[PDB]
Design a protein around this ligand. Structure first.
Ligand SMILES: CC(C)[C@H](NS(=O)(=O)CCCc1ccccc1)P(=O)(O)C[C@H](C(=O)O)c1cccc(CN)c1
Ligand SMILES: [Zn+2]
Length: 304
């Protein structure tokens, strides 16, 4: 069965998306925004108190298959939202005023592969013409300085940028959805691990975002808020200089679409366990991350 303090396989996460929605129809609606290469359903949960023309924040998890704490966080977030609505003042206000679009797992095919065959798989599972090598790096696959830096043009490599921007059904589906809802989406949050960082644009180029000063101030405050809970220390800054250049990222693309608050989170840890973060750290990791996500949400709502 499903547990919020264990890593859950896709079959279980899928059943959870149906169950948590049916149990909370006044706060959650579920849709599918497309299919993966292997025909799995890309679910999206709209979390919020339904109402006319609300603003929104979009958050996805599970871009990269092996980053299991990412998938776990999106699930943790949804329960927090539904359990505390009506009781905790901030979350109640948040869900009254805006919607969270939560995409619990983007790269489902890769995630399944980490359960069935290879725990360290990263990419999608699409085939590539002319080779036996499988998969594209979804975070090199967006139309932002596409494949110009930090990306490989070889399908056998972990950072393969694809045959073209949005070549993958999964990234096409996410981009299609965001382009369809640009008028409402005010922030884009994409959850990864590990390294304990908050990153903002740019990553495909060393140029800085117009609101670089604001974004730095926001990230600084969010990492400060995160640390209050368990003392976990994050670093933060523009992607290119804070970790390394990587073109074709979804956060840079979202930002150049007009979404001025765009962030990549890298959750625990710092390398001791890396991608294989113990299930015993799920609760603490998710709890402290919630504080940063809520701080950002509170700020965004004050800047519509
Ligand atoms: C541990 C964590 C930092 C992940 N890095 S990773 O798994 O070791 C990347 C593996 C491929 C690679 C190996 C060697 C050099 C460059 C790339 P990530 O979540 O996958 C980092 C992410 C990405 O590479 O897509 C990233 C990097 C730079 C900027 C951004 C923000 N768009 C996001
Ligand atoms: Zn990642």
């Amino acid at each position: 069965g499903h547990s919020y303090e264990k890593y859950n396989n896709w079959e279980t996460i899928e059943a959870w998306t149906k169950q948590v929605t049916s149990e909370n129809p006044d706060l959650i609606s579920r849709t599918a925004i497309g299919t993966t290469f292997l025909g799995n359903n890309i679910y999206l949960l709209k979390v919020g108190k339904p109402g006319p023309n609300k603003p929104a924040i979009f958050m996805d998890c599970g871009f990269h298959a092996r980053e299991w704490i990412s998938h776990a966080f999106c699930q943790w977030f949804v329960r927090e939202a539904v359990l505390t609505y009506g009781y905790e003042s901030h979350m109640t206000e948040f869900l009254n005023k805006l919607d969270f679009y939560v995409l619990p797992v983007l790269n489902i095919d890769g995630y399944i592969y980490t359960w069935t065959k290879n725990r360290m798989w990263r990419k999608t599972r699409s085939t590539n013409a002319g080779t036996t090598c499988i998969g594209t790096d979804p975070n090199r696959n967006f139309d932002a300085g596409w494949c110009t830096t930090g990306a490989s043009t070889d399908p056998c490599d972990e950072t393969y940028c694809g045959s073209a921007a949005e070549s993958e059904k999964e990234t096409k589906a996410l981009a299609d959805f965001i382009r369809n809802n640009l008028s409402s989406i005010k922030a884009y949050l994409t959850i990864h691990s590990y390294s304990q960082m908050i990153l903002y644009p740019y990553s495909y180029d060393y140029k800085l975002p117009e609101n670089n000063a604001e974004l730095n101030n926001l990230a600084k405050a969010a990492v400060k808020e995160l640390a209050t809970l368990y003392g976990t220390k994050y670093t933060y800054g523009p992607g290119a200089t804070t970790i390394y250049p990587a073109a074709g990222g979804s956060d840079d693309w979202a930002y150049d679409q007009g979404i001025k608050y765009s962030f990549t989170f890298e959750l625990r840890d710092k390398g001791r366990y890396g991608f294989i973060l113990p299930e015993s750290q799920i609760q603490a990791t998710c709890e402290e991350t919630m504080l940063a996500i809520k701080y950002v949400t509170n700020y965004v709502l004050g800047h519509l």
